[PDB]
Amino acid sequence: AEYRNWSKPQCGITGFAPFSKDNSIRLSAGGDIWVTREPYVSCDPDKCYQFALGQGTTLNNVHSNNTVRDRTPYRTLLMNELGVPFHLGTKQVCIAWSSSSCHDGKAWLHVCITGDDKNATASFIYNGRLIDSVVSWSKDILRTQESECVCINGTCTVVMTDGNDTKILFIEEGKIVHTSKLSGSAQHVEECSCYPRYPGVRCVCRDNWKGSNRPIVDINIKDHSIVSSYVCSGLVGDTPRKNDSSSSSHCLNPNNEEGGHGVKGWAFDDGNDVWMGRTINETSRLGYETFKVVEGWSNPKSKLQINRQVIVDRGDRSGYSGIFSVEGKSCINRCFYVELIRGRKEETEVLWTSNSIVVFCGTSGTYGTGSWPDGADLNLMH
Amino acid sequence: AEYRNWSKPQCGITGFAPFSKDNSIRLSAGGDIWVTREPYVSCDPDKCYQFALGQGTTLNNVHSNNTVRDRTPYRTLLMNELGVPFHLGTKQVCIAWSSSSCHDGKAWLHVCITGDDKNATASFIYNGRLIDSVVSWSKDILRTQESECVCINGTCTVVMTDGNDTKILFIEEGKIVHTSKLSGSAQHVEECSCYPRYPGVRCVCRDNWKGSNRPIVDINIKDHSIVSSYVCSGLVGDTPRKNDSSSSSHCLNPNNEEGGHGVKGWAFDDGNDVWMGRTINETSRLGYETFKVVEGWSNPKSKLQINRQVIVDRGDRSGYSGIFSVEGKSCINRCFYVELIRGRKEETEVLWTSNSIVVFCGTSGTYGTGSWPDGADLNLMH
Amino acid sequence: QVQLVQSGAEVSKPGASVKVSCKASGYSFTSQSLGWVRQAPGQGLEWMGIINPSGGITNYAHKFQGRVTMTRDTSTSTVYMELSSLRSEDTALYYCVRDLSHYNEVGHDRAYYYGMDIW
Amino acid sequence: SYELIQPPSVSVSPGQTASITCSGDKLGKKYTCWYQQKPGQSPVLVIYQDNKRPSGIPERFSGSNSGNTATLTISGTQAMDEADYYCQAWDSSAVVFGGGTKLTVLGQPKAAPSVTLFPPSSEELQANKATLVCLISDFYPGAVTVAWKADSSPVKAGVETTTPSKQSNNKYAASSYLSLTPEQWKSHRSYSCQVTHEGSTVEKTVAPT
Ligand SMILES: *[C@@H]1O[C@H](CO)[C@@H](O[C@@H]2O[C@H](CO)[C@@H](O[C@@H]3O[C@H](CO[C@H]4O[C@H](CO[C@H]5O[C@H](CO)[C@@H](O)[C@H](O)[C@@H]5O)[C@@H](O)[C@H](O[C@H]5O[C@H](CO)[C@@H](O)[C@H](O)[C@@H]5O)[C@@H]4O)[C@@H](O)[C@H](O[C@H]4O[C@H](CO)[C@@H](O)[C@H](O)[C@@H]4O[C@H]4O[C@H](CO)[C@@H](O)[C@H](O)[C@@H]4O)[C@@H]3O)[C@H](O)[C@H]2NC(C)=O)[C@H](O)[C@H]1NC(C)=O
Ligand SMILES: *[C@@H]1O[C@H](CO)[C@@H](O[C@@H]2O[C@H](CO)[C@@H](O[C@@H]3O[C@H](CO[C@H]4O[C@H](CO[C@H]5O[C@H](CO)[C@@H](O)[C@H](O)[C@@H]5O)[C@@H](O)[C@H](O[C@H]5O[C@H](CO)[C@@H](O)[C@H](O)[C@@H]5O)[C@@H]4O)[C@@H](O)[C@H](O[C@H]4O[C@H](CO)[C@@H](O)[C@H](O)[C@@H]4O[C@H]4O[C@H](CO)[C@@H](O)[C@H](O)[C@@H]4O)[C@@H]3O)[C@H](O)[C@H]2NC(C)=O)[C@H](O)[C@H]1NC(C)=O
Ligand SMILES: *[C@@H]1O[C@H](CO)[C@@H](O[C@@H]2O[C@H](CO)[C@@H](O[C@@H]3O[C@H](CO)[C@@H](O)[C@H](O)[C@@H]3O)[C@H](O)[C@H]2NC(C)=O)[C@H](O)[C@H]1NC(C)=O
Ligand SMILES: *[C@@H]1O[C@H](CO)[C@@H](O[C@@H]2O[C@H](CO)[C@@H](O[C@@H]3O[C@H](CO)[C@@H](O)[C@H](O)[C@@H]3O)[C@H](O)[C@H]2NC(C)=O)[C@H](O)[C@H]1NC(C)=O
Ligand SMILES: *[C@@H]1O[C@H](CO)[C@@H](O[C@@H]2O[C@H](CO)[C@@H](O[C@@H]3O[C@H](CO)[C@@H](O)[C@H](O)[C@@H]3O)[C@H](O)[C@H]2NC(C)=O)[C@H](O)[C@H]1NC(C)=O
Ligand SMILES: *[C@@H]1O[C@H](CO)[C@@H](O[C@@H]2O[C@H](CO)[C@@H](O)[C@H](O)[C@H]2NC(C)=O)[C@H](O)[C@H]1NC(C)=O
Ligand SMILES: *[C@@H]1O[C@H](CO)[C@@H](O[C@@H]2O[C@H](CO)[C@@H](O)[C@H](O)[C@H]2NC(C)=O)[C@H](O)[C@H]1NC(C)=O
Ligand SMILES: *[C@@H]1O[C@H](CO)[C@@H](O)[C@H](O)[C@H]1NC(C)=O
Ligand SMILES: *[C@@H]1O[C@H](CO)[C@@H](O)[C@H](O)[C@H]1NC(C)=O
Ligand SMILES: [Ca+2]
Ligand SMILES: [Ca+2]
């Protein structure tokens, strides 16, 4: 087994095709299924896996009450093969209310954060063994990507933030070998969706304070230098945001439109164009769409989209989304998952909060239309 | 595959980082989970496993009533990958109401004791086949470590006690090749937490009759000689015990403080210092803490601790704890598990007695604070 | 120039209901949660609940569950507090507050505790 | 339900350092806030996240949270710092306040209260009513707690107490009323009014005879 290098061009992409769906909530009405949130997908060279942060309980369970709380000592990182729902046989790979995972070509790395809000601990588990650990540096809720990290030549990069102070850690076989502070014009960086862009790593993240345009972080694996900006596209990708006719953007600064909230999302470049996903509803996490914005990676005045696809209808709930990359015979493909959140507090028919997932992958072929929502009937679940 | 030699220095340790947690009791309120007690963790060169002694029943089950009894013909040793809760697909590897397990680098060895109190039988299962057996020698409840044994160069050592007569057995591929009687100044030795200390094996055990300082047993693998003493540290590690200001200790004798009871625990040496865990509460199994006592391995007057960590808050239940060792690239790391006991007789809200586990591993990095208790709400479980 | 201006004083009969309003300005209305703290004459502060103007989700203190309704109108940058089944011990000074905290109970992914910076 | 315990009153002299504590179970694990309420205006955030000061708050105000106690510290106290101070934390997203602490910058020496307990007037008893009147005067600082006793058992219902107000001599006074039925008045041997001021208690007693 050799280290992954991702030294292949990005695949030609006309859009995205259906890949996977777990139907987790529908199954939990007749079976013991974990309560989860913040899921993501990552693949080793052989097969793909779905991850999620459990709540230490199943859904049909007295302990599923009040699972809207995001930090508890009972949250663990769940790992299953993609398509296997989180049943009672699921492996909890570490203790975590925030996490990131990636495969360097030889073994799995898990970054797992747990503990007190003012004094959290990030554990670094490589090939099933704890190798390193680091304490919160700002003493104010240490958190990380909630999606896959990226490894190149045995060096894995993960973005972590503390307090409102964002750092980029370089990990070799579980050992922190270098730490770089976030540099550039991105003012707030959270929950980065990173992907290999040889010879470096590119991340599209979430600005939870000042902008509805997503920040970008570029990581150089060789000299550990960091540069950061914002996605130029005049069609911004965060939620909440203004409508398409009145929204604006900027390549270096946050747009100062609908700050104070956000949602984890993704985008990746295709020449001067950008592929991105976002919620259809501009204010709430309803629906999910993907499209390409021509000149969207380099022109902040561009609002010309093409190749739109509805992933979730505007009347159905979505949630977090992120990117994962897969190495093919000749090119690196881009895929993404969508978290489909159900329950409290937006839905009062039940006492719990959980999610299912739907997964799409880039295609060079052709495709049609559809909608793949969670599909559970909360009114009937009691 | 080659035999393990553990011929590497002990890793530098600043403390312990979170590793695993199974949330067994919380899940059992919405799913079929085994009733267990006396758990432990052991790893082969590839992955780690959690063990426990089942009670022949799940929790939501009429047979979970009166599971405070510790010896029944229905108890079996359960084996799962670390992090996979004991669901109905769990393998019962042998019949046992007392057990020990270890991997010699080639295959698994299980020591399993079952049968009548006055005439128990220890079975020795190696690579899934029964190789040897021995009868109780004192005819008064034969028992063993309830944690991992230690193998060096194909020779595995396990500590076993009968009656109030403690013996150390040397096993090669499942066959008892030598038996040594316990020698030295340790007066009562039970439930040893053993770890490889090249070229030998060191065990920290439980004196259930005369001392709240833990006994030590040192095993020479080459000449089968045994020497035994007590942990010097003036901060003793058993429960019950006196408070820190009035407790005393001795390097060769039991301290004669709060005898008649105890709890399985662990400790390991770091030069002249000792790392150890213990319950926070001095009289009951409430809370769990770890710390280093400077000169604690060689000075019985030392009460100077540093690097304290709260594993379980003082208001939450703990239980047995033990050590397991893991071979890294250049050093041998020390990890430990904590059994989190819930139910009868200390808690009368339910009819059953069971446990979950939390696992920590030594780190050379930095860490914060927290508390990781069982977390089940017994009041709501009915 | 962040400020909260509240409606005028009210006298109400026991058993009826009272509705107080509060207009926010100086910042984007949808960016921060707004809550209500009351103070009986000569007593301490007592929190009633909060509303997230982005989504309208509310979180009430247990003592007032079933008695209080908080609403928001983003077009007018105004929040309201309606307390029903009024009793004599509801006589108090009612403060409108801006809570910079992020509560899971009103739609935030990561709970974050700050405090009430504008009254 | 979680609770925060503050001392009802704390006194210092101009330029001295005032320290207001706030106690709660494992309070060091949680985030704390401190609010300053001057007479007649709204509360003001002076400390958030245990020890952070909002912009514009004087650096004399400092905060600390460790173990089970949170502490607000005001170095070199000025007369304008006289106010009520509230600690604040969260219990499962629910905001919780301490009882509040009155801070007094001493402008005169302390004075013990004078307590006068009036039985119900015969004109009130003849009107089938009964009100005990406990009048407290000439004390400083202006902070007292009143406790009523039926014989030796504490009374809780029917008690109403006013906030200490300033007299013409710059000292403070307060009143407390215990309303009860005429029959409750005759059925007990004695009633007592306990006024505790700065840690020491002054009590008066009346009887139906
Ligand atoms: C079955 O499934 C397939 C696959 O999913 C479906 O095909 C897909 O359909 C969607 C929806 O229509 C398409 O996305 C949309 O793309 C258009 C852009 O494409 C149009 O404009 C192009 C540019 O036009 C200018 O330039 C050309 C130069 O040639 C001139 O001729 C023009 O006059 C203009 O000057 C044009 O090139 C395109 O033609 C090409 O593609 C079409 C296929 O659609 C073919 O017929 C042609 O042969 C040619 O190959 C095409 O005409 C975007 O405009 C869309 O976004 C707008 O609409 C969204 C709603 O759908 C909305 O959400 C957006 O916000 C956006 O808003 C627009 O309208 C607003 C108000 O109405 C305005 O405010 C705003 O400014 C904007 O104008 C959307 O992105 C996919 O590309 C297409 N995929 C593929 C692979 O073809 C198919 O429809 C399904 N069929 C059924 C029956 O379900
Ligand atoms: C976030 O997480 C991190 C990681 O978990 C937390 O850090 C950890 O904090 C715990 C708790 O404080 C520490 O454990 C404690 O260690 C002290 C010993 O350390 C102190 O004393 C050292 C010795 O002091 C003498 O010698 C020096 C020589 O330099 C002189 O200067 C002194 O004056 C003395 O003569 C001293 O060297 C230490 O300083 C070093 O470490 C501190 C970090 O704490 C730094 O500030 C320094 O820069 C320096 O690097 C330090 O001052 C033990 O005393 C503790 O045990 C006592 O307290 C326990 C309660 O916590 C109690 O259960 C024990 O029984 C014990 O009891 C003591 O008190 C009793 C009554 O009060 C007495 O009866 C008894 O005799 C005894 O005195 C405890 O073991 C960890 O070491 C620390 N870990 C790390 C990696 O730093 C951090 O606190 C968390 N933060 C938050 C906000 O949550
Ligand atoms: C799921 O969790 C919710 C939130 O904790 C539970 O709702 C709360 O339940 C408690 C009962 O344990 C209620 O407290 C009670 O209030 C009454 C007054 O109404 C008081 O007399 C009691 O002493 C007790 O304090 C609380 O009001 C209630 N809150 C809400 C918002 O409903 C709920 O019970 C849980 N459900 C299940 C099935 O576990
Ligand atoms: C769980 O196990 C306990 C312990 O065995 C059970 O409690 C016991 O239940 C038996 C019934 O089978 C009780 O015996 C009966 O006692 C009455 C007199 O009270 C007598 O008239 C009957 O002939 C019979 O002997 C016994 O008292 C009771 N003991 C205690 C301490 O409760 C319990 O029933 C079991 N629960 C379940 C759900 O299986
Ligand atoms: C995006 O999703 C949000 C929900 O998260 C949608 O907001 C909802 O919109 C409906 C329809 O306007 C609101 O109900 C209506 O309220 C008006 C108020 O005047 C009333 O006249 C109607 O009779 C009806 O009750 C609903 O309150 C509102 N929900 C929230 C939480 O604000 C929004 O419409 C979606 N956007 C798009 C473009 O679909
Ligand atoms: C990752 O490692 C590979 C293999 O060691 C490096 O491959 C070299 O790539 C450069 C240009 O990309 C070539 O000139 C060399 O001939 C390659 N060497 C070999 C042995 O194949 C690659 O450069 C490394 N990339 C990063 C980003 O570290
Ligand atoms: C375990 O077996 C190994 C391999 O047979 C032994 O390794 C020898 O170690 C000694 C000193 O430790 C060296 O002088 C020899 O050169 C080693 N031999 C080889 C072949 O490597 C080791 O001594 C054994 N240890 C025990 C405790 O039995
Ligand atoms: C878009 O939002 C702006 C708010 O500035 C509003 O004036 C405009 O009417 C909206 N346009 C549409 C098409 O909804
Ligand atoms: C410790 O225990 C002894 C009992 O011998 C008692 O006298 C002493 O007060 C205890 N100390 C503390 C701090 O509890
Ligand atoms: Ca945003
Ligand atoms: Ca003992």
TrEMBL record, chains A, B:
Region entry Head of neuraminidase, spans: 10-382
Cofactor: Ca(2+)
Keyword set includes Ligase: no
PTM: N-glycosylated.
Keyword Repeat annotated: no
Family, as annotated: Belongs to the glycosyl hydrolase 34 family.
Function: Catalyzes the removal of terminal sialic acid residues from viral and cellular glycoconjugates. Cleaves off the terminal sialic acids on the glycosylated HA during virus budding to facilitate virus release. Additionally helps virus spread through the circulation by further removing sialic acids from the cell surface. These cleavages prevent self-aggregation and ensure the efficient spread of the progeny virus from cell to cell. Otherwise, infection would be limited to one round of replication.
Record protein name field: Neuraminidase
Gene name per UniProt: NA
